Every structure is written in C-alpha cells, then in structure tokens.
Write an enzyme that holds these catalytic residues in place. Structure first.
Site, PDB file in Angstrom:
ATOM      1  N   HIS F  51       0.843  -1.148  -0.022  1.00 28.05           N
ATOM      2  CA  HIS F  51       0.075  -0.045   0.068  1.00 28.05           C
ATOM      3  C   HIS F  51       0.813   1.357   0.056  1.00 28.05           C
ATOM      4  CE1 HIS F  51      -4.057   1.627   1.154  1.00 28.05           C
ATOM      5  NE2 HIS F  51      -3.103   2.772   1.008  1.00 28.05           N
ATOM      6  N   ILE F  57       1.559   4.741   1.416  1.00 30.02           N
ATOM      7  CA  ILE F  57       0.522   5.606   2.185  1.00 30.02           C
ATOM      8  C   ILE F  57      -0.023   4.893   3.561  1.00 30.02           C
ATOM      9  CG2 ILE F  57      -1.522   6.960   1.655  1.00 30.02           C
ATOM     10  CD1 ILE F  57       0.631   7.836  -0.128  1.00 30.02           C
ATOM     11  N   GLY F  60      -5.942   4.676   5.288  1.00 25.96           N
ATOM     12  CA  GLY F  60      -6.923   5.449   6.188  1.00 25.96           C
ATOM     13  C   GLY F  60      -7.566   4.486   7.057  1.00 25.96           C
ATOM     14  N   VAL F  61      -8.043   3.317   6.711  1.00 27.96           N
ATOM     15  CA  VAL F  61      -8.869   2.466   7.601  1.00 27.96           C
ATOM     16  C   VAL F  61      -7.801   1.919   8.745  1.00 27.96           C
ATOM     17  CG1 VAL F  61     -10.272   1.709   5.749  1.00 27.96           C
ATOM     18  CG2 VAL F  61      -8.209   0.565   6.107  1.00 27.96           C
ATOM     19  N   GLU F  65      -8.786   2.327  12.884  1.00 28.76           N
ATOM     20  CA  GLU F  65      -8.399   1.208  13.817  1.00 28.76           C
ATOM     21  C   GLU F  65      -7.446   1.970  14.595  1.00 28.76           C
ATOM     22  OE1 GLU F  65      -9.523  -1.463  14.075  1.00 28.76           O
ATOM     23  OE2 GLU F  65      -8.302  -1.931  15.703  1.00 28.76           O
TER      24      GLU F  65
HETATM   25 CL   LIG Z   1     -13.005  -5.075  14.207  1.00 31.43          CL
HETATM   26 CL   LIG Z   2      -6.316   4.966   1.995  1.00 36.03          CL
END
Ligand SMILES: [Cl-]
Ligand SMILES: [Cl-]
Ligand SMILES: [Cl-]
Ligand SMILES: [Cl-]
Ligand SMILES: [Cl-]
Ligand SMILES: [Cl-]
Lengths: 152, 151, 151, 152, 152, 150
Positions: F51, F57, F60-61, F65
C-alpha cells in the site's frame, strides 16, 4: 537545493528495502559535512516480535545500521548529487565500526535521530561519526567507514 | 554440556524470531571461550531488502550473531543451563569496538562465531573474536553486553 | 558452470521468498543429475509454527526443495543458462511417490539435494534422489514436474 | 466428539501454528474413519509472494501438508477425543507419502477441501488416503503415513 | 468486457498488493451499477497473529477496506473498461467513510463477500455502498467514497 | 488512571498485538473525558509492501483502527483503571464508525497523533469522536461506538 528529503527521495538513492531500510526522513543535508535524518520507531515492526517479547527494544546494531544508512545518503549524493540513475548501480559495503556506545534503550514511540558528520573520504570510501538521539538526549555514539560498492 | 542445539538456545537466550541469530553451539568454556554458528539462507526476510537481487547478510547482524553467542556463554556461566531464569532476563548491548568486515556473507554460508571473554566482571561481559565461513575470517569484532533484569 | 550460487539460482528458477528453497548448486550434469543444498536456520518464518518450541523443518518443504533442484536441472538441460527464457516458464508439480522421511531436519543442518533423472520427455521431467544432512540420508523421494509456459 | 470443528477448536488440537497451520475448518469427522475439512485460499498469504510472482498458485506440497494436518486432527481426536491438555504435549511428523497426483492448480479464491479415510492406524502411527477438492473437482490425490510424537 | 474476474485480472487493475490486496475474485460486475466479489478468510494470514491471539477475528476495518477495493475495481472498469496499461498509473485514495455497521464477526473459513452498489460518482471520485456477507448473512454494511487519483 | 502510558502499559491493557497494535504511546489521559495517544509511522512496516509499491501511504482504515484502539484504551482505564486483570477478561470490539474524513495522506516519518474525546456513551458501549493529526494539522477525523466485550 532542497532542505528535507522524504521517503520517496530516500528510496531513489539508497538500495536498501524492507525490512532493512532504516531511515525515514532527512531534515538536514550539507554535502561533504553533516547529515541529520531520522527513523520512527513503532511497535508495528516485525523486529519487535523477537527483541524482546513483552519488552520491545529497538536492536542496538540496527541503530548503527541506521546511522550507516544516513551516512550512505551523504556518500551517494556528495559523490554524484541527487541522481537516481547513477545510484541504481551501487550498494553500500560496511567496512568498519568503532567507538559505539549505547546509552539509552530505544523503544516504540521514540524518534530515532541520526546525527552524523563526515570525518574523511575518498572515492567510494567514507568515514563518518556521530550519535543517535531521542528527544534531544543522546542514545548512541558511533564511528564507521563504508564503501559504495558496485552491484556488478 | 559442550554442544547445544537450537532447543537449548531457545531456552537460554531471550531473543526470538526474527532476532535469534544463532542456530547451534559447538564449543563452550564457562568464563572462557565459545564458538558457534548460524546458517545463512535465502529463505530469510532480511534478504528481501538487503539487497534485492544481491543478497548479503547485514554486517551489523553478524555482530549481533556474535553478541548472542557471547550472551549464551555468559548466561550459562552465571546460572548454568537454567530456563526459569533466562525468561527473567534479557541481553543489552553496551559497546561495540574494532569491528572489521572483510568478506561478504551470503546465502549458503555456515557463519561461525568464534569468541573468547576478555573481561568477565559480574553480569557485564566483554568478548572478542571473528566470524568465519569455511575456515576463513569474514569479520572480527569486540563487544560488551549486560545480562540484566527484564520488566 | 558447475557451481551455481544463489545469484544464478534467482535467474533460472521463478520461485522467490518464501518459496525458493535452494541456496546453491554444487554439482550439475546435463540431463543426468544435480547436487545442491539449502541451509536450515532458525531465522526462517516457517519455524514460527512448525513447531513452536521445537523447530522441525517440514518434510514436504524438503520434497519441494528436491523438486526445485530438479527444476534447475530441467531449465539448464533444455536451454543452458538463459535468464529470460526462464522468466516465462513456471514449475508445476505433477506427482510425488516413494517418499520417506528418516531423520528430522532442524535449524543448523545443511540440507543437501541429490537428484538424478528417471525419465525426460520434453518439459515433463521425472526425477528421484535423496536429501542428506552431514553424510546420512534424511529423506528419499521421486517426483515428476513440468516446466510449462508462465501463462 | 462433535462432528464439525472451527479454527478455535483446531488450534487446541493441532500443534501447528502460523504460517504452517493449513486447516481452517472441519466439515465432518468419524473416529478412526474419515474426515472432511477445508482451508480457504486467499491472495493475502505470504506464501504467494514467491510462488509465483505475478502468478499465484498454492503449492502442491502444502496441499499434501494440509491433508496430513486433517488426518492429524482426526488421529488426535480418535486417540484421545477432544483433549487440549494431551495435545499440548505433542507434534506431528510425516513418515511417508505415496501416489500423490496434482490435477488442477489451486489459486486464491478456491476453497481447498480435504478428504481423507483411514487406511491403517496403530498407536501414534496413522496412515490416511484421500483427495483435495475445489468446488467438487478433484484437485489432487494423495496417500501418506504420519505419526504423533511427544514434544518432549 | 466481462463479469467474472480472477486474481490475475484483479492484480492488473488495482494497485493494492500484499498484505493489503483484500479481494480475491470478482463474481458479478455491472458497469456504473453494482459489483459482487469476495475474499477468502484463512488462518494463514499475518493479521491474525495479532487480531486476536487465540481468537482469530478478521479486522472490521479490513472488511471496509475490502469493499472499497471492490468498489475501486468497479469504478476503474466503468471509467476505462478493462485496461491494465492505464490502470498502471493510478492509486486509490480513501475520501470518506459513513454508516459502517458490524453485525457478525468474520473468522477463518468464512467467505467474506462484497456487495457494492454505486450511490454517486463524478470524476475519479465514487461514493458507493453495500454490505459484507458470509453465507447469505450480512456481517457488515458501510458506505465510502474512494479516490482514483493518478499515481504520480 | 495516570496521564502517561508507554507501549509497556498499552500492551498490558489492549488485546491487540503484532501486526495490529496501532497505538505506541499515550501522552495525555483524563478518564471519562479524553485521551491523546499516537503511533509512530516508519517505512519499516510490512503494510507498506502493498500500500502501495513505490508510494507508501498509511491506510486510512488503519488510522481509524488506531483511533478506535486509543478510545478503547481510554474506555478501560476510564472504568476499571489501569488494571491488567479485568483487562485480560473483557475485550474491545467496535460496532460502528461514522463521519470519517481523510484529509492528508500519512506516510513514513509522520507521528500520527490520536485525539479522542468521549461522546454519547451507554455502559459497555462507549462512543468517541476526535481526530488524528500530524505536526499540528488534521490528517483525519471520525466517530466510533465500541463495546467492551468479553
Ligand atoms: Cl474489528
Ligand atoms: Cl487509503
Ligand atoms: Cl541492544
Ligand atoms: Cl552490511
Ligand atoms: Cl507446485
Ligand atoms: Cl513433517
């Protein structure tokens, strides 16, 4: 001439790749004199699974390696300027390490700063010396000399 | 015992993957010398980045490998084969000196670590020696480390 | 062109980390046989789960190595040492039979692959041989593989 | 001795761990008889980085390993029923393998289904034979003998 | 064009790679309209070494990430047809995430299915929404707006 | 409760582990109120291998988290306090995520600061809002509802 050098720039010079590229950013570069760069130390690094379980401490030798890479950036560039093509043929050979002392352990959360300054050079051979620092306080000291070898 | 296999190293040393760089022990002399080795193979993650298309065991890791062999000599010297203690300790590098790399180490090499103590003093140990591939000095170095409490 | 090092192996075989299980070719004789090996070290991912606190190299991976060594034999036997014809020829496994594991392989062992051709028919090679560690046989098997087009 | 088992159960029984635990679920089981279980194949597996770059194929040898692990589950539960305290003290070792045929390549997306019947068992040594199936099609054939050894 | 794509195809359109390529196969696809794909969840994934030890649970956030990629494949495909050469130049930036609901946990052996429908879309910006399903049951629903920004 | 926790504290309270423990340090903490933690971002993370190749990068996820975990840590110490015990028992689990906006891509060398404050909270269901910042500026924002399961 630019001040800071980001990861993309680093990838374009040093031949090191995961999981051995231990320099994240360059905050100061003075050709043929002093380089100041850093690598962030997070817990999300495979190296912490074994050093040591339930007590993550960034390996001492990897601090050395980091400084050696920061130095290498000085070498490649000083020796050719920011030129990725002329850099893609080389690699860096470690020749000697000296007067290294570890004073404070490095752990997740620390900004491992590499403060090196040239001491002597010639051709692909360069000797650099300096310290590694966290939040301003010294964590390590070292002197090392390397060669910019040919992939061949 | 004079020889130890990976099972024992795992019980004595606090290091684990991917930072346990000693596979077998061939010689041991409490408070004296210890020779050992680590096999180098392409099937190791470091080679993904050092260096693509040109695998070379990191010089710093040869030193680490020598430090571990020392740590193992040190730990057994202070407590004998003792698994219940080892888990209460860790090793901590103090200094590294006069370390020279001469021949690159690559996949396929049997990396031998040869060390002799130079300064024993308590928990703190200091050893010096060479790394050898096929009876040839590939590197040399002196190092000092402290076997201190975990927390 | 008798001894081939990891460098040469990456250019012939399509396998890469963590599935390139051959570190060096010590013997090679066109359409007849090949002798190679792979070092077993603890610093290998596989050892995290096979088995925790008792590193045992997987027998099936030993077979995989013997097959890969055989694949090196096929490639060179069919096209000499050509780094690009090889970028377009994966190695698919067809059969395995008469395999037997005798001594467990562990970190610190040199796993030597000894294979000979039982039958060659285009890009469909049948081999057989053994796997040795420090002199004794450790495994034996026979297998067939095809060096098909990479797509 | 229930018939269906989830990874949660598999963990307590089989000694295998990441990245060598190749059975996610048990669909059916009959003591000293047969066992049906499966392992999902995804691209998100490290093994795929090198086998083969730009062409993901689940290694045949691992399919075999997977069947061996299924038989193992079956053997463990047969020998001692669902018991984690005896399992904790054991390892499984491959003895021999015969008549393995690889018909179809397994790739990310496929549901690797293992099917094994007991050919012969005596003590810790078990012999099993069967197939590996994807969507019904017999992807591979295999015969093998494995033993349960004390981790000591 | 098509409506069934495998991992070789997926790899040719999306820039995601291991360990962040969370889509194995595209079963259904309708330009501009909707998309159905899935990812197999298996214990042999790195993420399980920590989420969570002795209780494998595929990360909720990763379920979301999987739907965005599925949306991304759909978006790219809708904008240029099946074109690897042009896709080769793009990245997928996450813009916004909303109405994300986790109903059932996703564990090893599940067939995490992606169901995405196109809400709104203009340029390289696509707002889609749908659900994640295992065995017909909705394990999660969510909405997001990804970005198909050129790669450099 | 205290106001400074290091990875050695986090380890003892959150269940997450490699490669999913996304919080390195907790700089400021005020129970029931807010929390300020952070995760260091280096290139030396496996995630960057995919990624993306030649353009890392931080996903974003994973930022979300990381925010969730921070709140989670806040939640536990904000009830049972720094108590490894109960902790080993109970266990975070996020049921929802709302108003997530990603404004600036995070890359190696950033110090992703997690700024969360307690919101509409039930009992075992803590809601949290706040942001993630780098060098003062807001790289992202979001709202999450988490339940301390068992
Ligand atoms: Cl989760
Ligand atoms: Cl992203
Ligand atoms: Cl150290
Ligand atoms: Cl080096
Ligand atoms: Cl194969
Ligand atoms: Cl085995």
């Amino acid at each position: 001439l630019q001040s800071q050098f980001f990861i993309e720039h680093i990838l374009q010079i040093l031949p090191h790749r995961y999981p051995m590229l231990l320099v994240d950013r360059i905050t100061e570069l003075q050709a043929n004199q002093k380089i100041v760069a850093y690598k962030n130390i997070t817990f999300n690094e495979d190296v912490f699974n074994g050093h040591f379980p339930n007590k993550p401490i960034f390996p001492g030798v990897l601090i050395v390696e980091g400084m050696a890479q920061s130095g290498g950036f000085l070498a490649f560039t000083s020796l050719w300027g920011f030129d990725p093509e002329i850099a893609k043929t080389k690699i860096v050979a470690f020749m000697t390490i000296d007067k290294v002392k570890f004073r404070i352990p490095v752990t997740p959360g620390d900004r491992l700063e590499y403060h090196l300054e040239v001491l002597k050079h010639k051709g692909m051979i360069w000797q650099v010396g300096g310290t590694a620092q966290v939040d301003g306080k010294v964590v390590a000291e070292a002197e090392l000399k390397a060669m910019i070898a040919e992939r061949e």
